[PDB]
Every structure is written in C-alpha cells, then in structure tokens.
Amino acid sequence: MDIDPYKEFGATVELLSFLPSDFFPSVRDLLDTASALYREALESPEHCSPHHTALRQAIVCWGELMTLATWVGVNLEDPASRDLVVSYVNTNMGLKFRQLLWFHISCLTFGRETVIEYLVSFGVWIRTPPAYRPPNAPILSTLP
Amino acid sequence: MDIDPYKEFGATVELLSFLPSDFFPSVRDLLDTASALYREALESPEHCSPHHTALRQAIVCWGELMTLATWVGVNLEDPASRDLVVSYVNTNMGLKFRQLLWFHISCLTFGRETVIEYLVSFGVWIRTPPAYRPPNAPILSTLP
Amino acid sequence: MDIDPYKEFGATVELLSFLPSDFFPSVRDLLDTASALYREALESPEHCSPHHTALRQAIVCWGELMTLATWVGVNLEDPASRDLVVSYVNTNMGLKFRQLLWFHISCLTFGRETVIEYLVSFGVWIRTPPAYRPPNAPILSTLPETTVVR
Amino acid sequence: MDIDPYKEFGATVELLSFLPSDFFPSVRDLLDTASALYREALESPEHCSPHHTALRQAIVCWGELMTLATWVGVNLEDPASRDLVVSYVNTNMGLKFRQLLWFHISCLTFGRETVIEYLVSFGVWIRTPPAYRPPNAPILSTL
C-alpha cells in the first residue's frame, strides 16, 4: 500500500539508509535497552506515544519472524542451509528492525528533531574526508 | 517484554478469543478493505490515530514475513514441505494478522466501544448452545 | 560566452581553485546527501532557490555525462582504454561536479556568506606553506567539534 | 532522484514531447541567439531569473560535454568511429540540450505562458491529420 513507517515521524528509509548498516546496534542490545528503559510503558495500557505503539508492534513482528525461523530450522536437517537462511534474515530484516528500534528508542530518549539532525550530520560526516571534518564521530548523549 | 498489542487500546488476546479462528476474513479481503477506506490516511505523513500507526506497522511486518517465506520457497525445491511451511505460516501468523487487521479496521469504521461491545455480545452468542442460539448473530453495521 | 557559474552566487572559479580534490566527497556521496536532505524540494514544482535550480540542472547534465561515458566504455573493447577514459572523466569533470554540488549544498546548509568566508580562510590556509600554517585545516560543520548531540 | 528540469517552470518532458526532435534549432543557432540577446545578463553577477541560472548551467555543462567528446574522438584511433560517437552524442545529448536551450530562451524572450500555450498549440497542429493541417505551423512572435 506504499507505506513508509517513518514518514509519520518525519523521516524516510532514504534518510535512514543515509547511515551505514554497520552503525546500528544489534537487535539484542536494542531490545535490552527497551526492556531497561521503557518496559513499564510498553507493557502499559496507554497510548503513551506513537513511538511506543510502533515499538510494540515492531517487537511483536520480530517475535513472529524469529518464531518462524526457529521453527523451520528445527524442522530442517542441514546447518549449512540454516546458516544461509539466518544470514539472509539478518542482512535483510535484521537491519530494518535495528533501524526501526534505534529510531524509536533514540526518539523517546533524546528527541525526534535531535535524531533527525543526528542522522543528517552523521551522514555528512562519514561522507566527508577525515582531514576536513571533526575527528571524533558524532554521538547522542543525555549527559551535559 | 510481554507486550499485548490490544491492551494499549482496551482489548486483549483473550477477549478476541471469544471469536473463533474461522471468523476472521482473509488477509486479502482485509487489505482490500483498508486500501479502499483508509489508504489516503495510511499513506499520510500524519499520526491520524494509534489505529493507523499500528495498521501501518502490521502491514509492513506482513510484507516482510511474506518476503521471507517467498524467498524461502523459491530457494526451495520440494512442494510438500513448502505447502507445510506455508500452512504453518498461514495458520499462526496469518491468524494473528487477521485478528489485528479486523480489530483496527473495525475500530476505525465502527468505533472501539462498539467493537468491544460486539466482542462481548458475540461471546455470549457463541457460548450459547446451538439449541437456544438465535440465528441472527450479532454483526457490526452502520445500518439497521 | 565566458560564463562563471558561481559569479551569480558571489564566488568564482578562482576562489574554489584552491580547495584540493582531496576536499570534496565522491559524486555518489554528494548525490546521496542531496537526495536525503533536499529531495522533496529538488523534485518540487517550485523555484525554491537558485541553488535548487542549479543543483537540478547539474544533476541532469551529470546523468547525461554518465550515460555518454557508459555507452562509450561499453562500445569499447579494451579495459585499459576504458579505465583510461574513466580516469580522465573523473579527474576533469567529476572534480568540477563535486565542486558545484559541494558549493550549493553547503550554501543551502550553512549560508552563502559563511561558505564564502570559509573559502577565503581555506585559501589563506592552503596558500600558506606547511611549515608555517597550522596542521588542522579549517572546518565547516553543523556540529560542535566535540561531535556530541544532546 | 526523478528531477524534471521543466517542472519548476510549468512544463514537463511529456509536454515538450509534443514537439518533434527535428523541430529544435541547432545548438549553434541557439547559442548565437542567447549571446546576441542576453550575453550581458548571463555574464552578470545577479540572479536575474531562474531561466538565466538554468541557461548558464546548461551552456557550461554543454561546453564540458563538448570537451569530453572532443578529447574522446582525438584519442580515438578510427575516424570512422569518431563519426559514430559524434552522431550518438548529437542524437541524444545535443537534442536534449537544444530542447533545454529553446525552452529557456523562448521563455526569457516571449513569456513562459506564451511558450506553454505554444507547446499545446503545436501539439494540436502536429496531431491534426495533414489533409486538415494548416501549412502555417505555429510560430512564436512578438510583433
């Protein structure tokens, strides 16, 4: 239906592909971050924010995807092909799920506008030659 | 996280268990209903509602599950296990997806209060033994 | 006709003749930057700014150059000559296209006066011998050099 | 990006496709006209108009395409292949350029409204079967 999960939040898949795929933290690290920071609000019966809603739906999505993959792996008999399918699922869906988690957690934690500024700035940075840019990479921080 | 995608709205996976699994329309029918009624809002850059947000996320998740299953089947060469895995996918994930789509499209069309009262009344109807069960089951409708 | 594409914006080829080719990101990097930052406006039916106009025109003719060079290389048979013509097109036209894209993007981002002041200072720096100039070139960035967003 | 260089003005590549390819004057003719009529404004340090901006960019990048094609043909071993490459560059890049120059010069000279109405009228004229097609093809004119 030509739906972009970010354009209601002011971002785009083009803007999140503006960053390297090797930048987004792992899905385990991000789920741990969520469980630590916003578990009581995600398990809550409240529309605390569209970020909370999308994060809930995304977590359930990953649950279903992992269930399917684990089931077919259990039912299959070649670890080689199991490795192939897990490589595919990671490379394709795992990156998209990491971008979805990162975006929403970072939004809740810092600011939607701050996260978009960070996207564009880090893109321009990693694209600019080192000798003519700030030497240390940008980073989001709550500590003043 | 033990997230329930319905208590954020006012329902639960045990309140929707009042409806059987053979009650929910096909994913094709429900996606057609969506494309017909709320495409302009699902493709919109606005948080028109939590129902819209959840429906977008779910549609994307379904596109993703179908991508995975299609890639798998295509890389596969045996028809029996392929039909078996697609049957498992349909049953489990398609049923959860149908529940989600039905709930959200109905809460957008008829209202959440009406949908929950309908769930309660249909639970009464389907619990009533058939000998004392009226034939005119409850149905969501804007007309008499 | 002896036209200067930057004279309309207050710069010149002599003011950008100092920036080395080591200074401008790749054409793909700059095109991705544009597609991510100002796509909604470059694909718009409005004259949002002369920078947008020039950027659209530059992107179009760069695509034209690329079609030409691709067709030529494909119709050539020796990879030696293919890479020779590719190196020529890079060193000659890609540098100018990166120059233009950088100028316009950096203008739209920071400010025309800011970009021109940066060019003046970078010229002062790159004209100065290394034994007498600081080792860290001047920098144009939307961030503080601490690079920590809060 | 799907940039259309005429959209910011009000035309499209499907509106200029109304005019054939053999309709647009030669790059030499259009450059001579541009010089004679707006040299002082194209060499000027002013955003005199988006038409001026686009025309400057076009002229410069065409000079660049010409440098590339000249260098290629020179370093090319066979003049018979030089003719092939010059034919290709003309057919594609030269035609697209003569459409870009014509559009902008004709706008800057007569009016963007006039140029778009002329595109529509020429579409009518060229769609009309010849038995009922006037020989007086539409033409842009001030007097």
Residues paired with A140 in a beta bridge = C149
Cα Dmax for chain C: 55
Residue corresponding to tokens 């260089």: D5
Helix (H) or strand (E) holding B4: none
* Beta carbons of A134 and C143 less than 8 Å apart: yes
CA angle B82, B83, B84 (to 5 degrees): 90
Nearest chain C residue to A110, by CA:
C150
Nearest chain C residue to D64, by CA:
C93
**Burial class, B56, CB count within 10 angstroms (exposed 0-12 / middle 13-18 / buried 19+):** buried
* Beta carbons of C65 and D69 less than 8 Å apart: no
> What would the two tokens of residue D45 be?
């340090």
The candidate with the shortest Cα–Cα distance to D63, out of D21, D91, D33, D101, is: D101
Helix (H) or strand (E) holding B119: helix B112-127
Q: What separation in angstroms does the CA of D72 have from each of C36, C84, C94, D106, D126?
A: 34, 10, 16, 33, 38
One-letter amino acid for residue A126 of the chain: I
Q: Which residues contact A119 (CB under 8 A, 6 or more apart)?
A: A11, A15, A16, A18, A19
CA angle C71, C74, C78 (to 5 degrees): 135
Residues paired with C149 in a beta bridge = A140
* Beta carbons of B8 and A46 less than 8 Å apart: yes
CA atoms lying within 13 Å on the CB side of residue B56: 30
Asked if B50 contacts B9 with a C-beta cutoff of 8 angstroms, the reply is yes
How far apart CA D102 and CA B63 sit, in angstroms, is: 47
Tell me which chain B residues have a C-beta less than 8 angstroms from the C-beta of A54.
53-54, 57
In chain B, count H helices and then E strands: 6, 0
Asked if B44 contacts A6 with a C-beta cutoff of 8 angstroms, the reply is no
Q: What separation in angstroms does the CA of A58 have from each of A27, A29, A32, C148?
A: 11, 15, 14, 28
Closest chain B C-alpha to A124 CA, distance in angstroms:
25
Asked if B98 contacts B27 with a C-beta cutoff of 8 angstroms, the reply is yes
Using CB atoms, which residue from C137, C142, C150 is nearest to A121? C142
* Beta carbons of A14 and C36 less than 8 Å apart: yes
Cα(first)–Cα(last) distance of chain B, in Å?
43
CA dihedral A98, A99, A101, A102 (to 10 degrees): 110
How far apart CA C139 and CA A131 sit, in angstroms, is: 9
Q: Give A128-133 contacts, CB < 8 A, sequence gap 24+.
A: A128/C25, A129/C22, A129/C23, A129/C25, A131/C22, A131/C137, A132/C23, A132/C137, A132/C139, A133/C139, A133/C141
The DSSP secondary-structure symbol of B26 reads P
> What would the two tokens of residue D136 be?
């007086």
Q: Which residues contact A16 (CB under 8 A, 6 or more apart)?
A: A6, A99, A103, A119
Q: Which of C61, C67, C104, C112 to mutate to test the interface with D (most CBs of D within 10 A)?
A: C61
Nearest chain C residue to D4, by CA:
C43
The DSSP secondary-structure symbol of C137 reads -
How far apart CA D40 and CA D17 sit, in angstroms, is: 32
How far apart CA B118 and CA D72 sit, in angstroms, is: 76
Asked if A71 contacts B88 with a C-beta cutoff of 8 angstroms, the reply is yes
How far apart CA C69 and CA C149 sit, in angstroms, is: 42
> What would the two tokens of residue B79 be?
């028809």
The resolution, in angstroms to one decimal, equals 3.0
Asked if C130 contacts C59 with a C-beta cutoff of 8 angstroms, the reply is no
SS3 at position B10: coil
A-facing residues of B in 123-142 (CB < 8 A) are: none
Touching subunits of D (3+ CB pairs, under 8 Å) are: C
Touching subunits of B (3+ CB pairs, under 8 Å) are: A
* Beta carbons of C93 and D50 less than 8 Å apart: no
> What would the two tokens of residue D23 be?
């309709």
Residue corresponding to tokens 């319905």: B6
Residue corresponding to tokens 């494309």: B35
Closest chain B C-alpha to A96 CA, distance in angstroms:
10
How far apart CA B68 and CA D63 sit, in angstroms, is: 50
SS3 at position D29: helix
Using CB atoms, which residue from A50, A56, A65 is nearest to B47? A50
CA dihedral C31, C32, C38, C40 (to 10 degrees): 110
Kindly give the interhelix angle for D95-110 and D27-42, rounded to the nearest 10 degrees: 50
Kindly give the interhelix angle for B79-89 and A50-75, rounded to the nearest 10 degrees: 150
Using CB atoms, which residue from B4, B46, B56 is nearest to A3? B56
> What would the two tokens of residue D125 be?
């004229």
Q: How many CB pairs under 8 A join C and D?
A: 112
How far apart CA C141 and CA D66 sit, in angstroms, is: 36
* Beta carbons of C61 and D65 less than 8 Å apart: yes
Q: What separation in angstroms does the CA of A63 have from each of A40, A59, B41, D56?
A: 19, 6, 27, 57
How far apart CA C116 and CA C14 sit, in angstroms, is: 12
Closest chain C C-alpha to D32 CA, distance in angstroms:
10
The candidate with the shortest Cα–Cα distance to C36, out of C122, C87, C109, is: C109
> What would the two tokens of residue A120 be?
């564009």
> What would the two tokens of residue B22 be?
């053979």
Q: Which residues contact A101 (CB under 8 A, 6 or more apart)?
A: A27, A30, A31, A34, A55, A58
Using CB atoms, which residue from C36, C141, C150 is nearest to A15? C36
Asked if B81 contacts B69 with a C-beta cutoff of 8 angstroms, the reply is no
Asked if D49 contacts D108 with a C-beta cutoff of 8 angstroms, the reply is yes
One-letter amino acid for residue C103 of the chain: F
CA atoms lying within 13 Å on the CB side of residue A40: 1
> What would the two tokens of residue D106 be?
């004709």
Using CB atoms, which residue from D1, D8, D68 is nearest to C53? D8
Rg over CA atoms, chain D = 17
The DSSP secondary-structure symbol of C34 reads H
Asked if A30 contacts A36 with a C-beta cutoff of 8 angstroms, the reply is no
- Solved how? cryo-EM
Question: Three-class SS string for chain A?
Answer: CCCCCCCCCCCCHHHHCCCCCCCCCCHHHHHHHHHHHCHHHHCCCCCCCHHHHHHHHHHHHHHHHHHHHHHHHHHCCCHHHHHHHHHHHHHHHHHHHHHHHHHHHHHHHHCHHHHHHHHHHHHHHHHCCHHHCCCCCCCECCCC
Asked if D9 contacts D105 with a C-beta cutoff of 8 angstroms, the reply is no
One-letter amino acid for residue B109 of the chain: T
Asked if C137 contacts A131 with a C-beta cutoff of 8 angstroms, the reply is yes
D89 contact C CB<8A: yes
SS3 at position C149: strand
Q: What separation in angstroms does the CA of B107 have from each of A53, B10, B19, B48, B93?
A: 16, 11, 16, 13, 21
Asked if C64 contacts D96 with a C-beta cutoff of 8 angstroms, the reply is yes
* Beta carbons of C65 and D60 less than 8 Å apart: no
Nearest chain D residue to C10, by CA:
D45
Question: Three-class SS string for B53-82?
Answer: HHHHHHHHHHHHHHHHHHHHHHHCCCHHHH
How far apart CA C24 and CA B37 sit, in angstroms, is: 49
Do B and C touch, counting CB pairs below 8 Å (3 needed)?
no
In chain D, count H helices and then E strands: 6, 0
B32 contact A CB<8A: no
The candidate with the shortest Cα–Cα distance to A18, out of A99, A107, A90, is: A99
How far apart CA B143 and CA B128 sit, in angstroms, is: 25
